Amino acid sequence: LVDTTEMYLRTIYELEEEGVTPLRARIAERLEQSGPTVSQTVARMERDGLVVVASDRSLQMTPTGRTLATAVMRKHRLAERLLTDIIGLDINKVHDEACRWEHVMSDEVERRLVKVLKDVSRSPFGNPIPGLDELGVPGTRVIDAATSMPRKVRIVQINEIFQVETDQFTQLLDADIRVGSEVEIVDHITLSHNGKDVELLDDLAHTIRIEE
């Protein structure tokens, strides 16, 4: 999304990366925003729990704020790879372009990019591309991945150890639906594999995870 928060978080991330203290004046100067504007925005981020102002008044991203900053930097750099590797955009405009793009590019497009690009280790500007492992390039909860139209997915985990109800244990074994098995999912959530279809119960639907 085209967030001011995302802009702020990625900026804190960038400074830290450069070995710079996430001081508010550095953020403002970097974002060209004024001191009062950054404080107004930082105070808003603290309430959303994405940042915290350290002792030295430097800004520390909470785990959530950091996960977000990382996604944004991932999309940013993945965008730059597309821009130079495929599109061929003037190298002097690739960064400024990607600054907008990091805000609109979806996770799905990032995975396609990771598959279609030759090397996604670094950005054209020599910086490592973060969050790839979180992008998935374990899984997503079947119930969350469950669309009203049948889609094929690869079983990531069944969380058998966390289940209280085990009635569906043999049912999945008969349907040959195991870890690594490419099985269809939909939205009750019925997983289909080996031709057979297992209509998951609430507990398994929430727990079983599948990648893409």
Added chain:
Amino acid sequence: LVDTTEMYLRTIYELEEEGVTPLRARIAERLEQSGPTVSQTVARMERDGLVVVASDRSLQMTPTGRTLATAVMRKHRLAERLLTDIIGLDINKVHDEACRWEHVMSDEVERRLVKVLKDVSRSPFGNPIPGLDELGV
């Protein structure tokens, strides 16, 4: 840029493209935004000289508003081609993504896409890509 103005202009273009009359109520419904909100935004657009509210309370885009409406549709359609032809994004997600990208793509990227893509005549959805001539490509 991610303008609401751009969102309104591209929506009027779309309606026109369907042979539908750009009525404030149709824009409201297409954008989901409320009637007052549309009236409020259309008012601002008029003042910027991008649209005029015609006799039948239909919205006519000034030549300026139409140049922009078209540029946006062009980036939209050029984006969709990149997503389907190169990136290989799921066809069922191409439009919504392009709906975001149309606001951020630059004219330099479009010219590059025009050069790198095999056919920029239509979008993956059969609609003709407008403004190519004005892009200078």
